[PDB]
Design a protein around this ligand. Structure first.
Ligand SMILES: Nc1ncnc2c1ncn2[C@@H]1O[C@H](COP(=O)(O)OP(=O)(O)OP(=O)(O)O)[C@@H](O)[C@H]1O
Ligand SMILES: Nc1ncnc2c1ncn2[C@@H]1O[C@H](COP(=O)(O)OP(=O)(O)O)[C@@H](O)[C@H]1O
Ligand SMILES: [Mg+2]
Ligand SMILES: [Zn+2]
Ligand SMILES: [Zn+2]
Lengths: 49, 371, 49, 353, 247, 556, 59, 79
DNA sequence: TTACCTCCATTTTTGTTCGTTGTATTTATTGCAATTTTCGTGCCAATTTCTG
DNA sequence: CAGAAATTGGCACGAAAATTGCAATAAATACAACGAACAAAAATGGAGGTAA
């Protein structure tokens, strides 16, 4: 994972009941950006026609 | 006995959770008629209009063309106050559903229906409309000269109009087609080694059932099924091997080298009733490096050979194809000339037989092939 | 060949490897399962085990 | 004969206020069926068409395509309600394959395992016999005397093979002893309801006890329940066997254009094969020692079809997995009641975090 | 960077995270010092002296680090790697005591209590009490909302029971089980239940008529009979038992 | 670009149903009005989560759409979230603030000795807010404020009164939220969770539904804002270990040793020794917990005149425990006291206890011993929830048919309701048992034969107060067990509708409601067993009787 | 042991209930909530109450 | 009525009858083209019916009387 | 010694809700007599083609 | 702008080949597929004990 600067305090109910409030600089630096790769196949075969 | 050196994986987990899978039920699909009826329901018709629409959409084929004439539909309605103009109005309303041009009587109607839904700003619309409306066989027969006379138009406008014509859709109902076509698994394989064609049944299609005999009558009856399957596959293998042996030349040099063999030859070679031979070879295929061929494909008629013997109709068809394939565009070969040309290699087929073979191969006559 | 490939490909104890991160692979390889052929079942296990 | 009414009439709703349940007569089962199933095969593999007299035949259960007969002489809506003379197929909607049942003619009578094995045994309680003796008689283990006549024997007396042979060698043809489901059918048919109820009521009123009191009360209550409704005891032994509509038991389509039979189709094929073999043996007039085991096997096949695994070993098709039967389809957590009627999936719905 | 709820610490009894936070801050502090010694070109002597003083800190640790065996290039590359924070190891049942954490906080010139004074970003006003700030190691689990989100208004239905399929891969609907039926019975909403049972799931003509009426701006249903009930009737009849509706 | 405007137009007033599985009671499906947002996650109001048992750590929800007009009107009139404030199993509110809201309202409504601005006089709540916002006075200063409160008149009208109250700045600021009709005494105290719930209950009983709906949102907003302003954090220095802990532990150890030797002496068998050790350790654990709590709940401060005073502490752990925002005593004791006794999944108790806490840290043996409770609490959720699902299925299937089908059957029969006293303290007074039931006979004066309550009278709060005044100890009421209605029950034999307050209506399926009300707590508490961590629930068996009040002793 | 066989076969022990009811030739009047849920009708409770009353007036 | 329906329930007196009456009036205003009795402000046909019921302009008796009068008018046009 | 009551052994039924999910090998033939279907080619009529 | 000729297709002919019901089929030496069976609770039948 990543090291994050964290503070423990209530903030206007945006961390109510196990929610997490995240800064925008976290998004601006691609700290939690992932890459996902997918495979698709096409098969050409023989037919009676 | 080889291993496939490449392949495609299957998308699934190797192991499933131990609970039994639910019984197979199925899943509905949307064909052309389902879509057309869905659009019919959401359209402001009356009740009689809806009945006529149901009758019309019932009679639409896969390509989207109306297979029955309107008299059949009006008769099928079963009422006497309804005229044919109401049927025409309902048909015109239906023809503008999605895809545009469905339920069209013929190609001209479909093209005109598709053309009527454009904008006037289109560069050459009236020219295309006139060409479709009046002079269609001229465009199909590749005249391009008398069409210029009748249309009173120069080269460029006619060419652009034809470009617009070849931009439409002649089979509007095939956009909503089937999901994925089926495929056939071959029964037997013919490979070549030692200059000989080895014949072997498909291992991936023939498993050996586990013998359930431990609780022991029922054991004897179960073995009866085993013996019956043994005899069945033995008969299939023997018939296929004999057929492959007879048609060795074709497997090597391709077409034009078949032999005119009938069920009598197989029956006498394997010492079996010809009805059994007919039964076993039905709807079964063999895989060769040349393709996949039905086991009944190698049986045909014959023609007399001048020097002696017979010639397979398949060989005659292939020879006719190869003769047509290398003719001069200026003067395409005719049927009589083709017969005269083939009557130098011992081939003796009547003009009628040549015409039948040409029609079977779906090749236009000489006058339509001239450049 | 049939028996060997059946065991290696369609057995109960043969699974796809977890590949989220190295820890998943290491943990999956060092696993002990009481289920499978010759073992217990999720319905006949008991409570002391 | 009017398309407006025809289209309207097929979407009408049926009005009701109650549900009635009872037994089914052979006449009722025949009335339900649109045809007779003879052969076990499901689909012909030379033309990929349902076979004649099979589990999917078009002449019995309906067309495989909308407004088309099987051979193809009549093909459009103008020919609705017209039976093709060649193939015998009706020209109508394909969805009628969901609501047309068939029937199978059993060569020998067969008992309904539900009215024999669900405690208390209805057949046993009606006949006042232990379940063990009924199970002996049904599965070809012992003989039962129907009528004593002038012999020392009495009705509902259990005899073995050697005892039956000795009785024949001693007396002759002055008494009737049988075995199998035919004997039970005859015993049920020959009994009376009102006389038995009156006699049992008098016996209960005369004697004083507790165990016999409860047993007689249960027996007279069962007799009264049978009398009040229109049911008759002999209907508990099946003669004609209904066949579910094909569209509710579809074949499993694999790859390559082929199909695999499901559990219900497997059980239907098994019972059909056993019935055909038993009928052929009956026509041939084979020795009885063989027809006995054949009838026992047919009884087992029917019992496995109706409720698999209730008595004896459960029949499995592959991978040592039991085959689902009609009873398993009805009951359980996965049955109709608790999976498709008391809770169902709906449209216009979504989900997210 | 991230603001968490203090109330979630005592009710879950996972105190360790808090400790991690404190120790994490200490680590970061060390890095800052080293970073300050690199922005201004301090000579290698002071750098290595401070790094050795940081490494020797502890109460009888088992690790002996001697930087006199390091060439200046190795020391400089080590400082370059440590400039973002000195990584710290605490074995599972032989970890770091609170006193060592406090000493490490003192070395980096940070308050020992682990709490600083924060300010509000919107009003610039100081929060009334000291707040705990530190560095914690966060992960991103493989439950992405891109996969969960799903909706359906009309699709394909099962062939036998004529009910919508289930699953996002099948483009299916959400199950309405027995307990939801019990809840709707408890409320007393009979029309909602009736339209859940017939016109959304199984009334083959009801679905079509409902869709047509919705398109026409007329909200009204004409319910019929579910197809699953007819399937049940056929399955019961196949057992040799006569069941039917009447009157 | 126009389909978005169309979509905004077609969902203006069109409720949607939100559902979360498992649906344990009728509050698992609720109807809301949509607000279109950008994203891929549903947003839920914080005040309904307690009804859904929903938290934001991966929970998913399903959404359904009503179609017909009757369905939409049912969603708005029956299933809307503003119609479900009171619980159908208790009559107590379920739309209740928790966690951050409770913590904020508790922090703002407290007092401190010699704060900034203590001893000044204010002309109303507005001057209190103006002083607090400018920094001239603290939220805990003790001031004297002129307050105007409105009391309801006998004919249903408000009469105003103005007076100088001694209060704090925070309570004065909070007073602007309370609607007119309530007394000032409700907010003139530190507000926990019970106080907020009782205040909402009073608001519903006095004013109505709509003022309660507005009041709840105002409370939520104020609590969020001031909890954010507080900056209340948690640190490792907050947990305080009492000095006398190990001493107590030492004593307990000795006792065990003694009885252990007594087991080797032949004067006591194995089971007696087991029970004695368990009871000794339970007593020691209770002593340690009480000592820790006593040490934690007091602070020393400087008075304005220079001498020392002692007040309630401002420790963060103490506030989070005392306010009732989140966390229970059984979870706070293990942080700075001792873990105590664990339990195996079969339910038995382990002899060896743990004498360490989470601030000090366990060792290997203590952790291995404590893993048993983790196994127990984890296996409970996985296995013993079927034992309650089956129970609620059977209850629903047995009680489904029962529906209120009449208005009054006319019976005189009933049952006698008396208080439930077990031990020295009253478990259930008479007021709670008879609240909302219909009397079967005329209730007499306690000392004379004079009618106090006419028969067939619904007992709302006023009648309960009248009964409490004269000290009535038993009242006969009508119950469904004796009802003359055929195929159902009548409205009077059932009594009050617990979720609305007034009498029940005809056509209510009370059987399903009762089955759900009985079934839900079992499943809920079974699934909530791992919070304590697998600790043992045992109270030392008392060996004596100790009276608490003057009076006579009677034996039966 | 309820009067109706639909509301009992839906619950538990389908085989025994169906066999007993079929032998007895029972009849179900569709009176409770579950039987009306099965056939997709208005439950005789709450918003669907009054309608049911009207029905019994026509009978 | 956009938030609660307490006033309409108080006027009608029963919560289950309120839904039926409101649905009847709403279906009158939706598929019958009747004019509302109160000035609507971007409202659906359900909230309009609820707000009409709040004012005391609509209930079972009023709807029945209006239906009977309109049927009498249909008879008058018929004869 | 009579009927009546009671305790031991065998059988049958059941065991939470969503979300995820997941099977395949192909299956009887086999010989006739009659039947129906299809092959090569002739013959004449109705287009296209031809120059004049 | 025309009638005489090439050209192609519909109909027809015997005759040879492909297709269908309809009674009639095995069958031996040999173990070897499993699994290894949960916890409670209620009901019914049988062997044993008892009032008389
Ligand atoms: N087997 C189950 N059957 C039904 N509901 C379950 C089951 N397992 C878990 N749940 C649901 O999951 C909920 C648990 O919620 P969640 O996983 O968010 O954590 P939690 O109990 O709130 O605690 P924390 O978030 O503090 O770790 C239970 O309240 C219950 O509703
Ligand atoms: N078996 C279950 N049935 C219903 N809800 C569940 C179940 N298991 C978990 N949940 C709920 O779903 C949410 C997400 O669960 P999920 O992340 O899949 O479980 P985990 O966190 O154990 O991986 C949890 O907060 C929990 O409350
Ligand atoms: Mg959760
Ligand atoms: Zn036909
Ligand atoms: Zn009553």
């Amino acid at each position: 994972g990543q090291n994050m600067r964290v503070a423990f305090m209530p903030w206007n109910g945006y961390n109510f009941e196990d929610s997490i409030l995240v800064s925008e600089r976290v998004v601006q630096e691609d700290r939690f950006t992932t890459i996902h790769i997918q495979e698709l196949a096409c098969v050409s075969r023989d037919t009676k026609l | 006995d080889t291993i496939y050196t490449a392949g495609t994986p299957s998308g699934t987990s190797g192991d499933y959770i131990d609970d039994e899978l639910p019984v197979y039920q199925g899943e509905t699909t949307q064909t052309l008629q389902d879509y057309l009826m869905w659009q019919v329901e959401l359209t402001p018709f009356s009740d009689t209009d809806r009945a006529i629409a149901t009758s019309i959409v019932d009679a639409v084929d896969e390509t989207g063309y109306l297979t029955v004439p309107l008299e059949d539909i009006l008769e099928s309605i079963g009422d006497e106050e309804i005229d044919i103009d109401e049927v025409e109005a309902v048909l015109k309303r239906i023809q503008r559903f999605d895809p545009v041009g469905v339920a069209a009587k013929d190609l001209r109607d479909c093209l005109l229906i598709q053309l009527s839904q454009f904008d006037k700003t289109t560069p050459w619309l009236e020219e295309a409309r006139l060409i479709i409306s009046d002079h269609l066989d001229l465009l199909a027969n590749h005249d391009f000269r008398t069409l210029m006379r009748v249309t009173r138009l120069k080269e460029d406008v006619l060419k652009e109009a034809v470009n617009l014509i070849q931009s439409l859709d002649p089979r509007p109902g095939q956009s909503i087609q089937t999901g994925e076509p089926e495929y056939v698994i071959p029964d037997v394989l013919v490979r070549k080694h030692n200059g000989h064609w080895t014949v072997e049944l498909n291992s991936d299609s023939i498993p050996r059932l586990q013998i359930n005999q431990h609780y022991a009558s029922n054991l004897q009856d179960a073995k009866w099924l085993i013996k019956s399957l043994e005899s069945r596959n033995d008969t299939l293998l023997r018939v296929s091997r004999c057929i492959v042996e007879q048609q060795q030349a074709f497997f090597e040099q391709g077409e034009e080298y078949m032999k005119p063999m009938v069920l009598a030859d197989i029956a006498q070679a394997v010492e079996m009733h010809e009805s059994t031979i007919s039964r076993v070879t039905t709807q079964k295929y063999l895989h060769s490096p040349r393709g996949i061929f039905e086991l009944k494909y190698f049986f045909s008629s014959h023609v007399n050979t001048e020097g002696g013997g017979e010639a397979s109709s398949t060989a005659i068809r292939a020879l006719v194809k190869k003769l047509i394939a290398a003719e001069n565009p200026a003067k395409p070969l005719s049927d009589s000339k083709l017969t005269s040309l083939l009557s130098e290699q011992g081939i003796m087929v009547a003009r009628r037989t040549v015409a039948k073979y040409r029609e079977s191969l779906s090749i236009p006559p000489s006058n339509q092939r001239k450049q | 060949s049939a028996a060997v490939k059946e065991f290696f490909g369609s057995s109960q104890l043969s699974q796809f490897m977890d590949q989220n991160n190295p820890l998943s692979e290491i943990t999956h390889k060092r696993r002990i399962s009481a289920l499978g052929p010759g073992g217990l079942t999720r319905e006949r296990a008991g409570f002391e085990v | 004969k009017d398309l407006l009414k025809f289209l309207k009439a097929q979407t009408k709703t049926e009005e009701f206020d109650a549900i009635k349940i009872a037994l089914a007569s052979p006449d009722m089962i025949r009335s339900w069926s649109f045809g007779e199933v003879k052969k076990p095969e499901t689909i012909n593999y030379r033309t990929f068409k349902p076979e004649r007299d099979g589990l999917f035949c078009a002449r019995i259960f309906g067309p495989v395509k909308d407004y088309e007969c099987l051979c193809g002489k009549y093909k459009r809506l103008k020919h609705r309600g017209v039976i093709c003379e060649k193939c015998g197929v009706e020209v109508t909607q394909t969805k009628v394959r969901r609501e047309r049942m068939g029937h199978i003619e059993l060569a020998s009578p067969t008992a309904h395992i539900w009215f024999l094995k669900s405690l208390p045994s209805r057949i046993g309680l009606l006949l006042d016999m232990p379940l063990r003796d009924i199970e002996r008689v049904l599965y070809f283990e012992s003989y039962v005397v129907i009528e004593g006549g002038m012999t020392n024997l009495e009705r509902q007396q259990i005899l073995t093979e050697e005892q039956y042979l000795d009785a024949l060698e001693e007396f002759g043809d002055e008494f009737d002893a049988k075995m199998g489901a035919e004997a039970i059918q005859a015993l049920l048919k020959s009994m009376d309801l009102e006389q038995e109820c009156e006699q049992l009521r008098e016996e209960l009123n005369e004697t004083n006890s507790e165990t016999k009191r409860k047993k007689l009360t249960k027996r007279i209550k069962l007799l009264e329940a049978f009398v009040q409704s229109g049911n008759k005891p002999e209907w508990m032994i099946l003669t004609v066997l209904p066949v579910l509509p094909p569209d509710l038991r579809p074949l499993v389509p694999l790859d390559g254009g082929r199909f695999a039979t499901s559990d219900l189709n497997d059980l239907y094929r098994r019972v059909i094969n056993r019935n055909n073999r038993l009928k052929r043996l009956l026509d041939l007039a084979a020795p009885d020692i063989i027809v006995r085991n054949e009838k026992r096997m047919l009884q087992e096949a029917v019992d496995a079809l109706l409720d698999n695994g209730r008595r004896g070993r459960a029949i499995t098709g592959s991978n040592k997995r039991p085959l689902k039967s009609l009873a398993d389809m009805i009951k359980g957590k996965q049955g109709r009641f608790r999976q498709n009627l008391l809770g169902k999936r709906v449209d216009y719905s979504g989900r997210s975090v | 960077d991230i603001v968490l709820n203090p109330l979630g610490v005592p009710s879950r009894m996972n105190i360790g995270q808090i400790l991690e936070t404190h120790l994490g801050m200490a680590a970061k502090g060390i890095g800052d010092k080293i970073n300050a010694m690199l922005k201004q070109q301090q000579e290698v002597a002071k750098l290595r002296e401070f790094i050795q003083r940081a490494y020797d800190l502890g109460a009888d640790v088992r690790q002996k680090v001697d930087l006199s065996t390091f060439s200046d290039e190795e020391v400089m590359r080590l400082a370059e790697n440590l400039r973002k924070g000195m990584p710290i190891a605490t074995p599972v049942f032989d970890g770091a005591k609170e006193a060592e954490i406090k000493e490490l906080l003192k070395l980096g010139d940070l308050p020992t209590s682990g709490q600083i004074r924060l300010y509000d970003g919107r009003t610039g006003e100081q929060f009334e009490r000291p707040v705990t700030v530190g560095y914690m190691y966060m992960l991103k689990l493989n439950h992405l909302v891109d996969d969960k989100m799903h909706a359906r208004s009309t699709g394909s239905y099962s062939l036998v029971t004529q009910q919508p399929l289930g699953g996002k891969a099948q483009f299916g609907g959400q199950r309405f089980g027995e307990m939801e039926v019990w809840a709707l019975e408890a409320y007393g909403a009979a029309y909602t239940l009736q339209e859940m049972l017939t016109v959304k799931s199984d009334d083959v003509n009801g679905r079509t008529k409902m869709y047509k009426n919705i398109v026409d701006g007329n909200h009204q249903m004409e319910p019929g009979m579910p197809e699953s009930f007819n399937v049940l009737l056929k399955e019961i009849r196949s057992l040799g038992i006569n069941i039917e509706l009447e009157d | 670009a126009v389909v978005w405007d169309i979509l905004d137009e077609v969902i203006r007033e069109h409720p949607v149903l939100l559902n979360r599985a498992p649906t344990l009671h009728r509050l698992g499906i609720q109807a809301f009005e949509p607000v279109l947002i950008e994203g891929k996650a549903i947003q839920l109001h914080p005040l309904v989560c307690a009804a859904y048992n929903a938290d934001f750590d991966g929970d998913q929800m399903a959404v359904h759409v009503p179609l017909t007009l009757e369905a939409q009107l049912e969603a708005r009139a029956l299933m809307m979230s503003t119609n479900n404030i009171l619980s159908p199993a208790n009559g107590e509110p379920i739309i209740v603030p928790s966690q951050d809201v409770v913590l904020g309202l508790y922090y703002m409504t407290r007092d401190c000795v010699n704060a900034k601005g203590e001893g000044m006089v204010l002309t109303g709540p507005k001057e209190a807010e103006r002083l607090y916002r400018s920094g001239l006075a603290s939220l805990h200063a003790r001031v004297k404020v002129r307050i105007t409160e409105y009391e309801k008149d006998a004919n249903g009208e408000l009469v105003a009164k103005t007076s100088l109250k001694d209060t704090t700045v925070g309570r004065a600021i909070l007073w602007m939220i309370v609607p007119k009709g309530l007394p000032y005494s409700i907010v003139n105290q530190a507000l926990g969770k019970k106080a907020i719930s009782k205040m909402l209950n009073t608001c519903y009983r006095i004013l109505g539904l709509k003022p309660t709906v507005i009041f709840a949102d105002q409370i939520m907003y104020t609590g969020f804002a001031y909890a954010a302003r507080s900056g209340a954090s948690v640190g490792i220095d907050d947990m305080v270990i009492p000095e006398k802990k190990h001493e107590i532990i030492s004593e307990a150890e000795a006792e065990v040793a003694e009885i252990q030797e007594q087991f080797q002496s032949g004067l006591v068998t194995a089971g007696e020794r087991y029970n004695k050790v368990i009871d000794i350790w339970a007593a020691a654990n209770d002593r340690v917990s009480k000592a820790m709590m006593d040490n934690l709940q007091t602070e020393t401060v400087i008075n304005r005149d220079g001498q020392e005073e002692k007040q309630v502490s401002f420790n963060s752990i103490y506030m989070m425990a005392d306010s009732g925002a989140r966390g229970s005593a059984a979870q706070i004791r293990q942080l700075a006291g001792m873990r105590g006794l664990m339990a195996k999944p079969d339910g038995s108790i382990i002899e060896t206890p743990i004498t360490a806490n989470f601030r000090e840290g366990l060792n290997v043996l203590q952790y291995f011993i404590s893993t048993h409770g983790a196994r127990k609490g984890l296996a409970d959720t996985a296995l013993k929830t079927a034992n309650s699902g089956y129970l609620t299925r059977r209850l629903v299937d047995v009680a489904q048919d029962l529906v209120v089908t009449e208005d009054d059957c006319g019976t005189h029969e009933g049952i006698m309701m008396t208080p439930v006293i077990e031990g020295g303290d009253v478990k259930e007074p008479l007021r709670d048992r008879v609240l909302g039931r219909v009397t079967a006979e005329d209730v007499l004066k306690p000392g004379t034969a004079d009618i106090l309550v006419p028969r067939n009278t619904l007992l709302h709060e006023q009648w309960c107060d009248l009964l409490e005044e004269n000290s009535v100890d038993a009242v006969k009421v009508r119950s469904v067990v004796s009802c003359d209605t055929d195929f159902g029950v009548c409205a009077h034999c059932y009594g009050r509708d617990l979720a609305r307050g007034h009498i029940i209506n005809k056509g209510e399926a009370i059987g399903v409601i009762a089955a759900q009300s009985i079934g839900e707590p079992g499943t809920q508490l079974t699934m909530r067993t791992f919070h304590i961590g697998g600790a043992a629930s045992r109270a030392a068996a008392e060996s004596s009787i100790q009276v608490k009040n003057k009076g006579s002793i009677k034996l039966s | 042991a309820t009067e109706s066989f639909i509301s009992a076969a839906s619950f538990q022990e389908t085989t025994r209930v169906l066999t007993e009811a079929a032998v007895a030739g029972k009849r179900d009047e569709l009176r409770g909530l579950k039987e009306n849920v099965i056939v997709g009708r208005l439950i005789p409770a709450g918003t669907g109450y009054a309608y049911h009353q009207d029905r019994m007036r026509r009978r | 009525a956009r938030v609660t329906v307490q006033d309409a329930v108080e006027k009608i007196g029963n919560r289950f009858d309120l839904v039926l009456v409101a649905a009847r009036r709403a279906r009158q205003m939706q598929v019958g083209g009747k004019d509302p009795l109160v000035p609507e402000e971007n409202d659906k046909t359900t909230v309009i019916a609820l707000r009409e019921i709040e004012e005391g302009l609509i209930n079972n008796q009023i709807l029945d009387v209006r239906e009977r009068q309109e049927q009498q008018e249909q008879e008058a046009a018929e004869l």
